[PDB]
Symmetry: D2
Subunit: 395 residues, 4 copies
């Protein structure tokens, strides 16, 4: 029916965009809001807002389990830490939102999709490269980037058209079950430290002095499946570790990162459950993956994180890396014990039915099975090519 | 006089090895003890012990500053973390010991060098590849690996040959320590479900002890070298020692790692490296402010490779040497200060400043001073996504 | 029955080894000879020789198709060129020989396997790492390396025990359907050029002046499946291109390579079919694989070739790379036209039903669909981070 | 005087662009023509044409040696082959043109630089990223991409404004050539099942022509720089030109490539680069003789990355610059001679010699002089294979 399908968050800009897009294009607007565990307002209140702001149809998709299962678990399996710091909090959800917006377009006669991203962020890239890969036939509208859009203009438009919207905190927040990101003007200066007011997912790391939390996280083929012996879904694992890590101030990040669009920016993140899961998963790989496979997998972990940050979730390199990763995870099964305390994650135990750790090869005790007679010859040949090079250097 | 040059630590085993090597080879032994900040017994007491055990010469080399400057600083510049966990505590010192043992051989007429490493560790590799690179003419003697030299054989030899040595009780800990960090291996910790207890720690206090007084510290670098702490100029050795103290008081740098040995097996070790972890963390944060994006992405690859080379006994290899040329160029503008809070066993960055910053407030900000030209973005996104879009179209066709 | 299973090539050393191993160990010997297309003597003549030299059982395994399908085709799919020169001629067959020797051990009550490799080559590594991965319970005997073995000693042993064996050319040859390797004393000097006598698989590149051979090689999901429109099996593809490439002197290689055991050595190879197949497969990937996937796949191609050279065919990194490769090959389907002439392979045509080449995006003709309005903005942001770095450098 | 500095090739389009830019901007134009060995019209004829078309100044820079020394030699040292096919013919010259255009701007009071690249090629990127790095104060004008400047608009403008220019017939070939190689694009070859015909070639003869007389050539390097041919000393430019001639006579360096443009599309191009391919082939062979194994493995990674950076318009990027520091160290011992036969369009190596060789005859040989200690091999194999053996055991358990 030649609709515009709007990725709808419930905020001022996308709410005004509904009738603004209607006027600019002459088309009806279907609002699509995704529950990723962002909390705050009930999703029905968001759904209703889009209707009151002129959407012909307004839908909520509960994608929390899908987000955990199909986006967060892959990030865990590639130990994804952008800059070796950031578990891709905002980046991971964008391809999922894209997927559902395309699906909604097929269902509701949409020929255009729209998003409210700005022109100096990464999110525009993640949305628009995604749309171009999944549905190039759809026109993509970026009203906030491409149409001389300002808050004042949006508010003036809302006033002129009696749009029922709240137009009344200096924090720019993005949160979901995987983590929370905070931008504020004060923190754009790199010598300014964050204050307690920036935080929500986590308690101050000083709170629980005599009550550390020791937790055991179990994985089966790279997927988190248990906490302290209790079976859990991936969403439940993330939520429980968000709570337990958050109570210990774990996962507070303060990062200067390279945006794909050419600039550095400073951001604050809270990602307690994510950091516990990625740390544990890494420790389990050290127990279950052979040396040279592990060395190379640190390269593919890094590449994967870059691809997803760079808006290339749907790229063929990312997809092929997933086939590599799936094979590596076959035996990544076992339990990792960590103490959560003081904002810190401290591993102190591992066990695995797929362990490559061999006590008898490692021990000096009576059970020692390592044949040391091999070592002299190994060292001689291991060192030979660089020895020959050194001789030449010195000649 | 065709001497044996012994890498001498002062321990019972290598002490009795001096006398034993003398009888078994008929050669004179020169003991060389290197001060790397291992503490323990005074070096002169160590030096004398070798003499009393039959060494014809016994020397001590104070290499603490050389170690910090020429080994620890390179590790900082490559953010060296083996397994992404371990800043190479025991690995770093080995090439420096090799260098000095070779120098001692040339000066004291040595034709044989000896070490006390075992046959299932990495240190044998680091020593012997080093010797093969720096001085292939020297024969290498490894009594522990190749001639079954044990504590028992040593205690027995010293009693049978009336060697004036005091036999110390056996420790449950296998410990290697220097100014850069401390490594602990115990039988109990060979079981991966056993957690360490407080008795394995020495360099660091439990995080709970000084919990009430978090320590905010500023570390300054110039061209990738640590040069100041809280505004005070320091040498690299002083930087390491001060941050060992301050991080140690906060329980920072406690590591518990299952690592891949080059000799094909996994093993579990405890490390304490408070100063090293503060320096490497701060250095990494400073590179995020001062190195361009794609240079940074590739340097994480070379950082990893460098750590592997040094772990694998390849400090002197031509790839390691060539990576150092790459690293030196990258460090030219790695100058600035990083502010961190040490608390709870954790290092928390909360500030950066740099006269070489690539951060541009006006390009990043949303305030009135915003200079970012957003008109470029639509086109950038179209072309950045185009090759994968074409691939997707083919996939779906 | 506590047998030794010998990897049996039919030569002097392994023939004498049969009764020598029998005396040294007191065990019966099962000889296992693999047909990899090495030609020369009929395989039955080889089988019979082992019996006459004292083997209790002697078997021939015809593994030519298996070698092509399961070892050569993976090498094609990773464009495997060691040193960017050598398509792993001798390296590829070793894991296959290992596989069949282990199988024979299970069938014939073998507790020991034996091979005739020397101590300064790569082949000992490929055999023994393979045995250690597939069957660590088997003792591995290396009589030629570990038992003070010399040709004179072997001949003296044969004389003393009346072993019926030929004990009478200075070439050290290893050949199979994938290629031919030649070692000779004269060529151990790097300023010595090879003479015509070193060659067998290929004609001199000067022969066919006015009769070049244009060939079309077709692939389906990375597997060679046609030549000049004719369907072929992978073995048939290799054999036909060996012939056609060989007639044009294609695939003559002269390489200084790094052995895993620490030394450089000089070797001559003939690999006409292999080089045609790998060249064509590479050209087809340039047509069918997206840019950044191709850039990364050149890294995995190199790593794969190193792993196989280094005796790590069965390693978990190699196996995981195969999962990566399998995904990349999904659309590597199409035909590559090349001229074979003068020792050279010259591509001059491609076609593919899975092509990523878009004529209309590339052309300047009337059909041009490239939107150039995007380019200014792309260049501005692509260049921004290094521009900012340059500004800092210059300040 | 707020001049426009025009990267001037001498072609019809940019010639009329001079006059057109003058009227459209009211600014004076300075034309800068760079001699990179493109041949064709005499540079002074080119220089004069710009003046006749209204340029206030017209200069010619002979950059042939600078190009060989500072751009082609780095490409040789990184064995630069884009797609593992293309030695960057057109990509290499762009940063050198940028440098000279910036220098000309400073000298002649230019505030604007202009180029004639299109919006779907790589050259726009190489020019504009270059300008943004070297001289961000300069405005960049791109008439072809941004102001619809075409041949037709040029032929029309020159007739309407009485411009004293001779209008040459359109070529079916889009050609870019310099001393390093030649690139040809034709409509016919935009179809991937069309083979090139003899008329697309110029730098090289058909391989059949001189088939009866194969050319054996020795190329010598010193620290990775080509310095001799058949014993005769040469400059890098002389090396390139001589091997262009000798390889060209044998049909060497004919390339036909489907490549990935940075702007997201594939395209098909023909190249002729006889001298470049001989030099890069020889340089690679020499590294196999003079660089240690693991250094060589990693350098194939940096070789690939360097070629990508330069293709992608990132010659001036800090990763490229840092890789150059890595490369310089690797080249220290890349000294020696490589003997090849040029014939049949093919380059066939058949000899190497080097005073810095890592080849050791006695370690390799099976003759009586054999020095390889085989007793080390069994142990090496046991430990080399151990981690994958343990993994296999777990897999099978
Ligand atoms: N949960 C969601 N469901 C649907 N669309 C979403 C969701 N989250 C984000 N988006 C889309 O992503 C765009 C960018 O997200 P964001 O950076 O959160 O901007 P916003 O929500 O529009 N403004 P703000 O109130 O500042 O967060 C939004 O404009 C929406 O179009
Ligand atoms: N500071 C040093 N100066 C000289 N040689 C050293 C030094 N530290 C270690 N070595 C050498 O390295 C070998 C292995 O180190 P280590 O594992 O510390 O052995 P050890 O000291 O002999 N045994 P232990 O008493 O248990 O520490 C020693 O046997 C010495 O040969
Ligand atoms: N086709 C095969 N079937 C079985 N075993 C084989 C085969 N090819 C090689 N081998 C084994 O691989 C070992 C090394 O191969 P090679 O280098 O060919 O040595 P050889 O054949 O024993 N001596 P030579 O006559 O010089 O080739 C041989 O000794 C055999 O044990
Ligand atoms: N030798 C040179 N000296 C100066 N500027 C150059 C030179 N070669 C190329 N350029 C610049 O690079 C741009 C693109 O190169 P090219 O593709 O050769 O364009 P053209 O020469 O204008 N068109 P054509 O006549 O078809 O070759 C040219 O328009 C000039 O601006
Ligand atoms: N505060 C925010 N809204 N941040 C959104 C982006 C977060 C992070 N910089 C990313 O690119 O993924
Ligand atoms: N406890 C010890 N002595 N450890 C020494 C070795 C430490 C560490 N595993 C290394 O290889 O460098
Ligand atoms: N002439 C030979 N037998 N060569 C066998 C080995 C060939 C090659 N150097 C490899 O390691 O694979
Ligand atoms: N025919 C041409 N003018 N080609 C110029 C570009 C050549 C090559 N594709 C490059 O990007 O460097
Ligand atoms: Mg929002
Ligand atoms: Mg990493
Ligand atoms: Mg010690
Ligand atoms: Mg043979
Ligand atoms: Mg390669
Ligand atoms: Mg031109």
């Amino acid at each position: 029916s030649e609709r515009v399908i709007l990725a709808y968050s419930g905020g001022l800009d996308t709410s005004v965009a509904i009738s603004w897009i209607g006027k600019e294009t002459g088309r009806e607007v279907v609002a699509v809001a995704i529950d990723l565990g962002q909390g705050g307002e009930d999703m029905e209140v968001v759904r209703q807002r889009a209707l009151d702001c002129g959407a012909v149809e307004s839908i909520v998709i509960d994608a929390r389990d899908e987000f955990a299962n199909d986006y967060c678990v892959p990030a865990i399996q590639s130990n994804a830490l952008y800059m070796d710091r950031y578990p891709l909090v905002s980046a991971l959800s964008r391809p999922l939102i894209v997927k559902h917006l395309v699906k909604a377009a097929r269902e509701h006669g949409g020929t255009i999709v729209a998003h409210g991203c700005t022109g100096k962020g990464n999110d525009q890239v993640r949305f628009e490269v995604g749309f171009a890969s999944l549905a190039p036939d759809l026109e993509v509208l970026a009203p906030v980037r491409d149409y001389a859009w300002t808050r004042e203009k949006a508010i003036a438009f809302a006033e002129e058209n009696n749009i029922p919207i709240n137009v009344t905190s200096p924090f720019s927040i993005d949160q979901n079950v995987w983590g929370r990101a905070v931008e504020t003007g004060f923190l754009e200066h790199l010598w300014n430290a964050p204050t307690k007011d920036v935080y929500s997912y986590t308690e101050d790391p000083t709170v629980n002095w005599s009550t550390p939390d020791e937790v055991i996280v179990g994985f089966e083929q790279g997927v988190p499946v248990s906490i302290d012996g209790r079976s859990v879904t991936p969403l439940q694992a993330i939520e429980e570790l968000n709570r337990r890590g958050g109570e210990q101030g774990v996962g507070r990040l303060d990062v200067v990162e390279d945006r794909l669009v050419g600039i550095k920016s400073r951001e604050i993140y809270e990602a307690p459950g994510a950091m516990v899961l990625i740390t544990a998963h890494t420790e389990l790989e050290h127990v279950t993956l052979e040396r040279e496979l592990g060395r190379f997998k640190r390269i593919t972990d890094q590449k994967w994180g870059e691809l997803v940050y760079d808006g290339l979730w749907f790229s063929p390199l990312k997809t092929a890396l997933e086939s590599f990763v799936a094979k590596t995870q076959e035996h990544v099964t076992g339990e990792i014990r960590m103490v959560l305390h003081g904002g810190h994650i401290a591993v102190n135990g591992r066990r695995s039915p797929k362990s490559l750790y061999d006590f008898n090869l490692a021990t000096y005790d009576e059970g020692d099975t390592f044949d040391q007679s091999a070592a002299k010859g190994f060292v001689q040949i291991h060192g030979l090519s660089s020895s020959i090079s050194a001789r030449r250097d010195l000649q």
